[PDB]
């Protein structure tokens, strides 16, 4: 999976930097203003960002980004100001400072729900970066920014690590993998997106059926309705008309869920004996979210087996879609279709860049108009000193 280098227009980034003012004046002006506890504009910090020329200068910016998040005008962070800091990071580091700010979403609050996620991902790919690529993909899911047509690119590299992972996952790992596949998987056009949705459902069903349901939706934008296993069977019931599926990784993971539950029920001392942290605390703090009328998910295991067993045989008769090539079929999506989608955002990139240019002129003329207004008022006040 690769992204074409066509979406690299550093010439436009050249025109973004237009202020060209010394950082000592900007840093001193805002530090004095913050000591007075007085609001500051997004223009001042943006000028500080646009005048970055060293890695030490970026550390000053991220410190000021942290303090501007605690400024009274934190919500007024312009899209381009975050974007400019991304480009400055991509010149020198491109690996650590951008990810660290994204890891501390609350403290800094850059939140770049733009094409820069693809640009940040693309440079990770061009440097053969995997461990950090997974983390930034997860944090995109937290911001749920899988909206652009190029969302296929993000969907690919999650599936790449699915092949590469051979490990007994943990409580958080299973939840993250399902969340990073369920919501990002939206390509009804392709069967690979449908397979990922089934794969994500099975992971959440393992999470829900084994320990609990509350932590599935605690920190992530998921649905708190129970019964995720029954939410995956309906997808396999949609194949009555839809002729495309992955069905390779979905069946393998469903069998793993089937194997785990078929041993958990008869062997309580083997699979259900793992939880041994606290007994008195758990009982006292136990919260029962489900009602009495709601059927227990444990009692739905025979119901799940009866429906699941018949469905798999039926789909093979007419679906005609059983292959592991989804690793390569999805790979060719970005190598061929994405360049067209890459050109789709080229014009949009100009539009967003042009809008930022208009706002910067508007912001600069806004400040200048009041600057002469203040001095005209000040000169008039001193010329005719009238006070009560």
């Amino acid at each position: 999976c690769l992204l074409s280098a066509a979406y690299v227009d550093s010439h436009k980034w050249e025109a973004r930097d237009k202020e060209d003012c010394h950082l000592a004046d900007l840093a001193s002006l805002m530090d004095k203003t913050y000591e007075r506890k007085l609001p500051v504009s997004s223009l001042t910090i943006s000028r500080f960002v646009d005048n970055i020329a060293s890695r030490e200068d970026i550390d000053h910016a991220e410190y000021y980004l942290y303090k501007f998040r605690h400024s009274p005008n934190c919500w007024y962070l312009r899209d381009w100001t975050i974007h400019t800091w991304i480009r400055q990071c991509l010149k020198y580091g491109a690996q650590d400072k951008a990810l660290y700010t994204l890891k501390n979403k609350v403290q800094y609050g850059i939140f770049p729900d733009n094409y820069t996620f693809n640009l940040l991902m693309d440079y990770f790919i061009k440097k053969e970066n995997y461990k950090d690529a997974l983390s930034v993909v997860f944090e995109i899911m937290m911001q749920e920014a899988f909206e652009v047509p190029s969302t296929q690119l993000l969907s690919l590299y999650v599936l790449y690590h699915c092949l590469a992972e051979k490990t007994d996952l943990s409580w958080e790992e299973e939840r993250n993998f399902g969340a990073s596949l369920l919501l990002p998987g939206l390509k009804q056009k392709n069967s690979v997106g449908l397979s990922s949705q089934l794969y994500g459902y099975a992971l959440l069903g393992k999470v829900e059926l084994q320990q609990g349901l509350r932590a599935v939706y605690c920190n992530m934008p998921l649905l708190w309705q129970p019964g995720y296993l029954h939410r995956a069977l309906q997808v396999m019931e949609k194949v009555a008309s839809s002729p495309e599926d992955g069905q390779l990784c979905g069946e393998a993971l469903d069998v793993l869920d089937r194997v785990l539950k078929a041993v958990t029920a008869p062997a309580q001392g083997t699979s259900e004996e793992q939880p041994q942290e606290g007994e008195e605390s758990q009982r006292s703090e136990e919260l029962v979210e489900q009602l009495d009328v709601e059927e227990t998910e444990q009692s739905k295991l025979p119901q799940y087996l009866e429906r699941f067993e018949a469905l798999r045989s039926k789909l093979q008769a007419l679906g005609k879609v059983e292959s592991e090539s989804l690793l390569t079929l999805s790979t060719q999506l970005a190598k061929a279709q994405l360049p067209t989608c890459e050109a789709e955002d080229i014009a949009v990139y100009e539009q967003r860049l042009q809008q930022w240019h208009g706002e910067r002129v508007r912001l600069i003329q806004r400040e200048q108009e009041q600057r002469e207004r203040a001095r005209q008022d000040y000169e008039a006040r001193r010329a005719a000193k009238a006070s009560a």
Binding site: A27, S28, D59, Y63
Partner: peptide
Amino acid sequence: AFQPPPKPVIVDKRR
């Protein structure tokens, strides 16, 4: 646990 960044110095010797 998040640790706030230390206070840096942005004064330049040029001026």
